[PDB]
Hints:
By secondary structure, the chain is an all-alpha fold. The chain contains 14 helices and no strands. Keywords: Allosteric enzyme, cAMP, cAMP-binding, cGMP, cGMP-binding, Cytoplasm, Disease variant, Hydrolase, Metal-binding, Nucleotide-binding, Phosphoprotein, Repeat.
Amino acid sequence: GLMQFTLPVRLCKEIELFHFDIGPFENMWPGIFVYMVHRSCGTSCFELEKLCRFIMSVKKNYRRVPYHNWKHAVTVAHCMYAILQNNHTLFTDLERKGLLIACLCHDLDHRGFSNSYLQKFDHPLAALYSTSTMEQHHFSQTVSILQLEGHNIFSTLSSSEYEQVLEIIRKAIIATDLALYFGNRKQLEEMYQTGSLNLNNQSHRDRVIGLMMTACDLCSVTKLWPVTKLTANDIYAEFWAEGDEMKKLGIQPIPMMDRDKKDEVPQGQLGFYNAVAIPCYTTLTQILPPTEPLLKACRDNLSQWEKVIRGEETATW
Ligand SMILES: O=C1NCc2ccc(NC(=O)c3nc(C4CC4)ccc3Nc3cncnc3)cc21
Ligand SMILES: [Mg+2]
Ligand SMILES: [Zn+2]
């Protein structure tokens, strides 16, 4: 308690906004994450020395890829922080402890390739894990790190509590497989509209937490336009590299991964907001009304992509 984390005045205020950007200073991101853990969980949730050792080992096992990198891990974590702070009565002690950690760890050792490419490549991980291939790898990496000497950030939990929080983290990381999101949002939509959704039902909590993980994972579409536009360059750098690797295998890539189809990006973005993003934040807002600013920011960026398609805005590449 004696030593507390503090941010400069601008960061202290703006970190509470859903659309906060964590900035270009990598050396500040560990401090920003600890600050969020102290405020959303408590200063006693973890021993600062173990948490600090854990954070630096996680950082080291993210790779130097354009998008699925250490900055994405902390960005996804910050979106979970904003959801938890604005819904603070709804989550348990273990959920607060597990969910920021799950977000930090959710893309561990990502190489910038989709499950589909690992399948077509016949990558060994595809034989180890037939479904949610990369996500089961991310979880396995989380367990490896937690089992390093001095890295057990959950050391004060009983065996049964430790087992629950690892099960929260496992389900949360697996839910970031966007293939699973379509089914989970459909279920949640029907449960909501038929008035059957029950936050005391553990299988219902799992689905709600899954949707929160999708919303956090996609949260780059919920930033102010200048941040959303520049981040779109990072995701497409990975997609186009995968598309190149698909062509090397003699397989035609899907249009969003073909770097020859760069002029069609604004229409593909429009396609993604309508089929995925807007439905995602809409269902989240129905279940957790204080998450409204995510949906509003998503609608604003959708309107910007339409302005691009009408030639009223220009996307520099
Ligand atoms: O269905 C589609 N038809 C065409 C198309 C094109 C692209 C996409 N996907 C994305 O754009 C996207 N995907 C992810 C998840 C890894 C999957 C996360 C963020 C994303 N966008 C984004 C936007 N702005 C700033 N940062 C990131 C889907 C389609
Ligand atoms: Mg992922
Ligand atoms: Zn991710």
